[PDB]
Amino acid sequence: TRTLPPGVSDERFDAALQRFRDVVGDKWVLSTADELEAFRDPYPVGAAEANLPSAVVSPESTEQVQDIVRIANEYGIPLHPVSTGKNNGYGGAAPRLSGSVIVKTGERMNRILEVNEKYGYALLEPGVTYFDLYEYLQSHDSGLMLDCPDLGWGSVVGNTLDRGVGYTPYGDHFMWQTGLEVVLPQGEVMRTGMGALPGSDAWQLFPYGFGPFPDGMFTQSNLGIVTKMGIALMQRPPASQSFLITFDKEEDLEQIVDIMLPLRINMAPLQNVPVLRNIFMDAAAVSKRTEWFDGDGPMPAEAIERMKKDLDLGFWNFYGTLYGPPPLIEMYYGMIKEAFGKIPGARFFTHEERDDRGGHVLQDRHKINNGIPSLDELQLLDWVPNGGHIGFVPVSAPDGREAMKQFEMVRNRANEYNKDYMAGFTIGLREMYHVCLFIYDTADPEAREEILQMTKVLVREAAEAGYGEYRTHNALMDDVMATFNWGDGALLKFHEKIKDALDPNGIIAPGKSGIWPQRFRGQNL
Amino acid sequence: TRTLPPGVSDERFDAALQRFRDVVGDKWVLSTADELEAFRDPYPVGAAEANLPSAVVSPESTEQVQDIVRIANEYGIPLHPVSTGKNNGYGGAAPRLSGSVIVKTGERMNRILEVNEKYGYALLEPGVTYFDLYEYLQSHDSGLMLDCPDLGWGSVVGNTLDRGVGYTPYGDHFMWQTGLEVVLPQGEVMRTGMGALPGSDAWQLFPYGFGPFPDGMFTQSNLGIVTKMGIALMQRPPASQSFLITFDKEEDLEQIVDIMLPLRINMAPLQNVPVLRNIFMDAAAVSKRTEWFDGDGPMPAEAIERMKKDLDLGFWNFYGTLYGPPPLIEMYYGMIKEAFGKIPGARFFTHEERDDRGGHVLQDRHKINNGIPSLDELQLLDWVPNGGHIGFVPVSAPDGREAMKQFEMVRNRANEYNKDYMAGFTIGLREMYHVCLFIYDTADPEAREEILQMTKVLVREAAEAGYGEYRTHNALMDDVMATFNWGDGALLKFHEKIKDALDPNGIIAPGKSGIWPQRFRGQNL
Numbered sequence A, B: 001t002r003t004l005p006p007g008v009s010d011e012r013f014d015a016a017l018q019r020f021r022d023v024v025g026d027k028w029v030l031s032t033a034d035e036l037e038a039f040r041d042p043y044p045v046g047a048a049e050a051n052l053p054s055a056v057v058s059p060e061s062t063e064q065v066q067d068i069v070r071i072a073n074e075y076g077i078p079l080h081p082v083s084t085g086k087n088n089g090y091g092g093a094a095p096r097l098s099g100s101v102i103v104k105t106g107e108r109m110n111r112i113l114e115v116n117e118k119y120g121y122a123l124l125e126p127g128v129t130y131f132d133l134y135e136y137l138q139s140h141d142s143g144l145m146l147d148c149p150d151l152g153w154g155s156v157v158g159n160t161l162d163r164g165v166g167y168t169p170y171g172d173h174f175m176w177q178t179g180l181e182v183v184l185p186q187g188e189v190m191r192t193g194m195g196a197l198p199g200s201d202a203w204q205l206f207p208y209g210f211g212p213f214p215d216g217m218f219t220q221s222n223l224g225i226v227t228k229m230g231i232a233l234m235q236r237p238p239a240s241q242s243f244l245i246t247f248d249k250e251e252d253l254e255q256i257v258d259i260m261l262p263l264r265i266n267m268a269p270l271q272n273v274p275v276l277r278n279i280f281m282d283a284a285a286v287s288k289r290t291e292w293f294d295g296d297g298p299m300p301a302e303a304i305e306r307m308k309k310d311l312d313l314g315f316w317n318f319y320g321t322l323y324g325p326p327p328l329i330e331m332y333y334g335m336i337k338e339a340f341g342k343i344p345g346a347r348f349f350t351h352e353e354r355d356d357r358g359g360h361v362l363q364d365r366h367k368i369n370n371g372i373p374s375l376d377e378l379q380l381l382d383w384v385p386n387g388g389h390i391g392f393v394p395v396s397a398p399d400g401r402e403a404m405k406q407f408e409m410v411r412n413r414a415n416e417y418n419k420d421y422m423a424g425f426t427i428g429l430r431e432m433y434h435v436c437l438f439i440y441d442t443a444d445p446e447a448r449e450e451i452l453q454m455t456k457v458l459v460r461e462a463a464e465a466g467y468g469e470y471r472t473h474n475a476l477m478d479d480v481m482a483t484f485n486w487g488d489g490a491l492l493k494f495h496e497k498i499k500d501a502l503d504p505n506g507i508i509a510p511g512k513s514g515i516w517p518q519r520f521r522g523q524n525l
């Protein structure tokens, strides 16, 4: 049965589609069931269908975005803006609110507007992928490098707008975002920062501009459709070296984290984002689950030991990258070896010392940590048939006992649903993330429903222990925002007031981050 | 004549005052003419009286702040929140809107709530000064250091809330701010970030939390009264060394800036915030104008040469600090000397080589750059009798030709209004600030009016050249916000919509950053 926007008749929707076609062109509006299939969540959560788009509209310009927004206000049609729509693990391109129209800005708004070599920045449209930007930098013999997530096919802009992250020293994307242009919910256009000062050359140089600083309000947000965004770019160092440290025991996590923090907090000797990945995560990158175990339930201890031995990895595997002149790299690596070498059974390998199957993750991290985009990690999804994942990422203090508590409680819950504990821990400077990926058969309704029910429990149990998530899937946005309820839900009430003021017709991505406009509030959508 | 809130009778104001006394106590509400004199702008701008407070209220707790806000809503009383009220150069404690009540949060809300050594942060109430925090750190044998502005008597919180800055690697205060608690304009209380997740230990560890990131909306803002704020604190390095480079010629600025940028953008070898100060600024720090010139009009070339020779300084004076093990300091200093030494006439001095009168600024920067608070810079105000200053700080690209343009155009206008050109240039990573302090006799109505009219022209001329200011004085807030008018004033319209939604009764600091609530908009206040 045809997916329609809430409250919009078939006939009114057909009329609205024609209005959208008049703006963007006939071939740039998709609305048949088969056309829309590719815009459904590739990794669906829950057995029942959810997050169904009614159409996709691909504008070519900011003006076209403004016109689309105006039409949507006239008809009361919700709009879900994306850049490349590769938010896989958190819903893909699919809207939180079923019946919403996807506004795929990146399809045609895909220009690199400027890369400035001297000051080190890019000004981008949403369709510029990490692969696209890398190709530009390489072909122009740039001295700059980008910072990419694990998969290079996403958007420099879209990733930033969900507060996505990478692993170089510029890994905090939002931090390095500098200036944006946004179409607000009734169709008006605004530039932030020094972009608001006509003729300023400092849009990509100074983020704040004058007065209240608004750019963060457009991240994980439903307050507009971003059409341009700037980001700072780091100079490529003269040399780099990546390394792996394998740690043999599950319980080593406590000591690893307690050493990681002091080596990272001053940004040296751990100069990049430290990542600690468990054996399940590293095995999934290079092998299928059935290589190790084809039975029912959690993987047994004997099979875990076989993964470690066959791949020459530990239960916990630390990956890092060093940058600078060779003598600096040598000094930092010496410090790292001295510190982590206090853990019995730790073994060290550089990216030059591992050409085996087990070393494939090290080789991938060496690319990612050097701003070389990759799709190697798509192999994770071959862990089981029809593989998909959902991301579950609580934030906590960088403390070894806190890490052990999280490890144990998530693994306990995963075991109940016969899901592997595939996880790592990362630190920024002062904060810790528990990066959990649950991989499952997307073709199995039971597995889809298990994932939904399990992750709802994980969210609750984490919150009960004082951990909240930094980012989440469509299916969990209400649940996660409900955990941030200090002062009787004060934060959400604040967001709601702002949403209603900027979006009185309730058009833009209703329900993103649990923030619903008045007309949808309290309706179990 | 008694200063009253706009539209509020003597009798209604008296009733509101009594309600405030019922909340905070009789001695914590000030409302006599004599009491209020001390809360006037110490460095008034314009001949006519302006920015007059009607009262000062000193709450002891968040709950008291909430009750004050509720009372202000009921009686229509505008509230200007401050921490320590030392925003000298930009209005002091005085409200933009005459007749507003100052809410001096810092008088009694002055506790250090937490200093965490391991993760490196503080959680603070508004009344904690830089001197207060330094005394705490020293007395507890901390391994942390703070980042202070030039004068240590301000508030760690209040400074951050105006996007104030210091000069260590943690010089961007707002960047390192992590979590806040705020009373919104109708009296509800909210915590940002992980503070919104009850029981989280990560309020001061991870700034963003979940969903749209709002903390920037409370800086240079009138959207609430902040009651608590967290900030990250850097670990103190094992050693440090400060240095001065004197450059003899006015025209050397171009080359200095063009060398500064590449030495700073990678955060090495220039590890701290680079500052370049002119001879007027450095002379004023150590001497009176009449030492050099007692005549009418701009200082002649012969007197400028005498300042340089007697103080053994250049026209432009570069100050920097290096941190780390002695070998690292030596290497970086070598790189800096090699690079800047290409400018003919450059001379180098370390903080160990130069404890003469001219070197007093070097010794002060060595304190500031090491998180040691100081009030030595108050000596600037002795340049002339009854000395005050106004801050004028345009932002531009870190380009030598741009610097020369700004130098010349600001100096031209200063000369025309008989004001000394006291200025420096600083760079962040990618952006440049032209830090102008105009010192004048605050007791002279003509001088006050000249300052106002000159700075209005400077704001306009800067905007015409594509430069906007990062921060400004009460008297210039409307003018500066008017320059950020891309898209027919889109930015201000956005701010106004948010202001009216959160503050329907138009209570909090009307006119801050040029943002007026509906009831005051378009009224020439």
Ligand SMILES: Cc1cc2nc3c(=O)[nH]c(=O)nc-3n(C[C@H](O)[C@H](O)[C@H](O)COP(=O)(O)OP(=O)(O)OC[C@H]3O[C@@H](n4cnc5c(N)ncnc54)[C@H](O)[C@@H]3O)c2cc1C
Pocket (backbone or CB within 6 Å): A081, A082, A083, A084, A085, A086, A087, A088, A089, A092, A093, A105, A126, A148, A149, A150, A151, A153, A154, A155, A156, A157, A158, A159, A161, A162, A163, A164, A165, A166, A220, A221, A224, A225, A226, A227, A377, A378, A380, A389, A509, A512
């Ligand atoms: C195995 C695996 C590994 C992963 N590793 C990482 C990783 O290392 N780091 C990481 O960050 N992610 C990671 N992800 C998640 C995901 O792949 C990336 O974050 C990806 O870059 C996001 O998709 P995108 O860039 O296409 O953004 P989009 O899907 O285009 O945008 C994401 C969201 O941002 C908002 N948005 C985007 N564009 C606009 C706009 N123009 N206007 C307004 N709002 C907009 C919307 O809410 C949208 O849903 C991983 C996923 C998988 C499956």
Ligand SMILES: Cc1cc2nc3c(=O)[nH]c(=O)nc-3n(C[C@H](O)[C@H](O)[C@H](O)COP(=O)(O)OP(=O)(O)OC[C@H]3O[C@@H](n4cnc5c(N)ncnc54)[C@H](O)[C@@H]3O)c2cc1C
Pocket (backbone or CB within 6 Å): B081, B082, B083, B084, B085, B086, B087, B088, B089, B092, B093, B105, B126, B148, B149, B150, B151, B153, B154, B155, B156, B157, B158, B159, B161, B162, B163, B164, B165, B166, B220, B221, B224, B225, B226, B227, B377, B378, B380, B389, B509, B512
């Ligand atoms: C010679 C000289 C040198 C200076 N050098 C520097 C320098 O190096 N760096 C720099 O940043 N400044 C500098 N200043 C400016 C000024 O001294 C400082 O920034 C000072 O720290 C600001 O005053 P404060 O900390 O008392 O903040 P306050 O005056 O208390 O607050 C400043 C503003 O922030 C807001 N605010 C404060 N508290 C709250 C609250 N609780 N809730 C809501 N809003 C609030 C208000 O708008 C308020 O007016 C200099 C000034 C002079 C005269």
Ligand SMILES: [Cl-]
Pocket (backbone or CB within 6 Å): B184, B185, B186, B187, B188, B189
């Ligand atoms: Cl409120």
